[PDB]
Amino acid sequence: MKGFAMLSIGKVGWIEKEKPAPGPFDAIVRPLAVAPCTSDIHTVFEGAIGERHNMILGHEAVGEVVEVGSEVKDFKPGDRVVVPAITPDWRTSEVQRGYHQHSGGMLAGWKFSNVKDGVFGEFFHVNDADMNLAHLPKEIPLEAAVMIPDMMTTGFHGAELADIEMGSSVVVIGIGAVGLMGIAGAKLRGAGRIIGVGSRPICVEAAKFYGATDILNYKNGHIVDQVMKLTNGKGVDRVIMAGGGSETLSQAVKMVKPGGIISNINYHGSGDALLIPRVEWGCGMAHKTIKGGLCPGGRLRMERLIDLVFYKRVDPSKLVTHVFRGFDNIEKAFMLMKDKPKDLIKPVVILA
Amino acid sequence: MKGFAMLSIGKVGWIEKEKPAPGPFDAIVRPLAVAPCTSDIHTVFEGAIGERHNMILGHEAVGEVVEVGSEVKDFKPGDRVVVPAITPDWRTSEVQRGYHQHSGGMLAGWKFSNVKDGVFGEFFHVNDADMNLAHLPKEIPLEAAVMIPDMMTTGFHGAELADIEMGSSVVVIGIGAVGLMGIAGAKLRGAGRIIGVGSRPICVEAAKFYGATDILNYKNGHIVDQVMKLTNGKGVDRVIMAGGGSETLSQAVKMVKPGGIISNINYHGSGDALLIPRVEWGCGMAHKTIKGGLCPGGRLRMERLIDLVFYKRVDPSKLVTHVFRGFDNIEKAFMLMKDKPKDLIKPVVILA
Amino acid sequence: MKGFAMLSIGKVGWIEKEKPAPGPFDAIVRPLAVAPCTSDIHTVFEGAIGERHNMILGHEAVGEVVEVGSEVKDFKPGDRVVVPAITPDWRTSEVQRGYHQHSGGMLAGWKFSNVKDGVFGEFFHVNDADMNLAHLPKEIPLEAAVMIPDMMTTGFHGAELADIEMGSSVVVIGIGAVGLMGIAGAKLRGAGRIIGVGSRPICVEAAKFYGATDILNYKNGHIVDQVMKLTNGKGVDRVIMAGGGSETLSQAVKMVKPGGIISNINYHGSGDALLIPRVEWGCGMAHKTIKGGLCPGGRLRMERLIDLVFYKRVDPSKLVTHVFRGFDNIEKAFMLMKDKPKDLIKPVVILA
Amino acid sequence: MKGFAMLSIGKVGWIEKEKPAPGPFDAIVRPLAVAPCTSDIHTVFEGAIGERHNMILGHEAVGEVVEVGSEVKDFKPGDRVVVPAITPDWRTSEVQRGYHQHSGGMLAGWKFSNVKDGVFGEFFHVNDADMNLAHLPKEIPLEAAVMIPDMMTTGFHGAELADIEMGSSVVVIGIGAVGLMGIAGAKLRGAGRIIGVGSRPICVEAAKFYGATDILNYKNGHIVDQVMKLTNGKGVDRVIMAGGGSETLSQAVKMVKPGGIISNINYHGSGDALLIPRVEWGCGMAHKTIKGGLCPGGRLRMERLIDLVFYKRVDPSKLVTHVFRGFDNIEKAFMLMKDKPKDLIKPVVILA
Ligand SMILES: [Cl-]
Ligand SMILES: [Cl-]
Ligand SMILES: [Cl-]
Ligand SMILES: [Cl-]
Ligand SMILES: [Cl-]
Ligand SMILES: [Cl-]
Ligand SMILES: [Zn+2]
Ligand SMILES: [Zn+2]
């Protein structure tokens, strides 16, 4: 089979690999719709998580079950499923500890396009079908469904980690796909004011649609100053770091109230360190908590988000600004995330 | 001054009381809009809180500050305010413990028409204005605003206590005003499926408006059997108890999943005890946590709920089915809560 | 092989059964030390979990692995291991929800002597050896180690659910083995005053040993009255229910502060319902949270408790008043739990 | 009256000041025993929190009330009291938010020797006596009690913020007085393995006494390698940062497991930023939570810590390596904190 792979740092291309076969608990799946992630740009062009050789890319897919192992009980060939970007080995210590994202080591629940051939191939392999796949309700369009495995789970996790109080104020820094789902998640956790930070007009409109009550641009002056101005010097209860550089951490510390929470869902891809401003962190005593977490995955996570879409709590289709037909256009969609045109949020490639 | 009072258990009527004066930290407030609460029906007629003599009733008001003590800093004569039903003494050990609702004793945070002349007078007294009042944006209509002091803080507290997971299923038993804000709160906490329980058509329509995806009627079979058939024997993740008898707890225990949470905000004003079904509570080992709390009050709570209304996260006006004008209709509005018309959710009396 | 079995309700005896064989992920273990649980007495003589036929009793063992399936990686024949009383199926929705104790159904994590042949046999079966077994350090005596599978995890879970604040006052109702571990767990969570409730002299001394500052005996007045007296009317921050009838629930509600928490770890094998006193539960608004959970099991839990024993944070050997040797003494140990004598806390039978 | 004070950055001396008078809620207290804090060293000589002129230093005292305001109810002249280091204004939004340490602003709950004359004078002023004083039981000697206002509440807060799981592993970096209480606190939260990092023999002995099961010295290699060695490369569940420079944060991140928590209580007094290592923090996605908080104060905190001392949960007397008599020796003790002789942990000056 063919797949679109990372050949080595800085290099991508189509390659040929043998079609994968399932273990007793696994599934072979055919992608029906897929999408490229900013994370893969980081890993390919920034070397953000080490070198790789001929690793098929991509980890956002809706698919058709093509075969299952003899122990798989809940899925069968022909079943349409949503595939989480995160597909943990479930029988590990980290799972017993409550962190499947890290089953087998740091970030190891994220297999596709990390330590496993991704979804940009004619077939891909899913470990532990029964624990890691969710059935796709026919009422959910492919384009929207494909926003669930990564964009929705990541953005909503930003809002979960934030431990938002009802009616409290939230700043979401960065309004790309993850940030927009951060705003939406924040809204679904009962935030009052939601201040989005960004400027691409299509992101700004998306942001308002998902619940931002205010939009700040980096031109009306420093973001921190603007937030202080909007809040009369009082700052905000929560900050979700969804994009930008690592100087965003400092901005977040400077913007939040003492006792607030800063939630990072941003995949930082470069730099040796992230910096915490000493003084505004109360010299370590301001109770400004800093969290940062890989999105949840697995079947339960998908079914929960599926329910959120099915019952129309959120509509992730607005994230999808580009849709292409055809296997080969995986590459086109991939290059789209690299040069990132100004009208782009998320591309989806339809394969059926 | 005049005030509408409980003369004694089973008796209400207008009385003449001396106009209250403020200590250095207090404000005197004149109401602009008020509403009656079901809980005052309990105390007046079921002696639910013991005997009382000439206690002015009511604890749901938006008002205007008339005078403030020499130590009051943030409010002055003229300001329009939302008054929480719960107005605690803030210098107590329960406050250091984090439970203002019980400052000075169980439920002691609730003073108005509990241990203090309530808001159905030409004027009323607010202890600690700076800590207990919040400015009312002019953008918010009185009939919506008056839903904040009690109905909203109560319904929402049901959803908070419930510790809702994003996408999880919630049953709300009882769809009166509080129950309806429970449904809204659940949605605002990110609930997927929300199953409301109750019959009154007008409540039913408000329940759908606030987020209910299902409405269960007692008399289509016992509620637990209905919930099971809806959820294919799986049960629900959370139950909020907002109305009905004490048998409601057993129903909750039976329908909620192990590891689930049952959140009560209902006033149970009759019977010696509530019953937990031993077997369905796993004989004590089912991790079915049971919680029950008085609504938060104070300035912060009000300010937070106000932001939710102000940024249109919730529209409380659909709670109001009856609007009266003039100080005299307070009586009519109160008795309306006693006989409970079919078309009634919540009555409001507009004064100026 | 032979095992000591529940022949049917009210009847116990030795039976012959075939030696179990392991699946790919399982282990066959031989007991090196075992102990009887009060829970089994309820099962056999009160039919508290339904009738059973020839079900081997017991679920507290330290053992020697004698056989492992082909997929077992961390355990091999000859390994000395601590076996948790709870051995869940790990690949289930309840696990993904964070509740292994309920994997596959309410309490389904508890297999041994519930839905599965228990440890009172020449051999027994442990499902999922890698997830469910823990290595026993040679430095821990068998009799101490066999308190870990159940007594310590249950008792400590009582303190965990109690969510104890440092320096706060805790009452533990019932000072049998579980309550004594409740006392120890509470001290290890940083409780200040710990008030144990019981009368048996041997349990009384042990309670003191594990950290009780006060021991209350019903012969000195109503427990609630006594707690109110000890706390000069203020009550206590937390109550752990570890023994007594279901009337302990009412006592616990009446003695805890508003905002407090009541943690049940007691197995109520009798009655139709537990009763919550209405008034003292603030008619549902006192923020008096009621929790109740089956103990955690599996490998992580065992390994954490082992560390606590290993580093001398707790000494569970004081739970052990009777040490027998040999399989026959299993029956003697069991019956000892039945007609519980006055010098008895926990009996242990050492097999090699 | 006489006071020992910071004249300006890098300068200390005795000065004469007006004896303060109480407001209606305040008390005037004379010190019976005081201790100096490393924090005052940072503020004076590193100008860590900015310029100051004639600010009486010190915020750790046990004292006798010599006058109260007309509104003070629970304290009278002659009463012996433990005075918390943190004495917040209780009627503020931050208190409503649950963060009294920052009442009126970041760190503002900390008044003595921050933005108010401290306890190193013949008298000092305590705002809101009834909320901020605790009675000293006669059973507690002055030297132990004076460890409560700061050392104990700070070290214990480190363990509380760390959210320790029972039997889990903890590294405490820095074993001066605060770190030693961090060790004790962690043991009182049910920690299993506890690894202390530090070198001074007297601290090493105290660390063992308080619960450290291992002790690491910077001399024997990089701390992170040492910890990876003690833990078979698995790292630890929690890290408490209680001393050292800011490079400690990077150490803590490298040391802790994914899903772990890092709790800072160290008062950093120099440098622009603190660095988080990008890679070891999973590029922002390792779920390695960073916390950092000023110690709780107020009456309740003191009362709970008094219980821990009274009921012999912790014996803070071992922190006191130097006791001097006489008011003038405040200077002696303070200079000890500057010079840090190898046998010093905490000095105490007895004034009665
Ligand atoms: Cl096509
Ligand atoms: Cl006051
Ligand atoms: Cl096998
Ligand atoms: Cl003993
Ligand atoms: Cl060990
Ligand atoms: Cl005051
Ligand atoms: Zn991605
Ligand atoms: Zn009410």
Ligand SMILES: [Zn+2]
């Ligand atoms: Zn048992």
Ligand SMILES: [Zn+2]
């Ligand atoms: Zn200090």
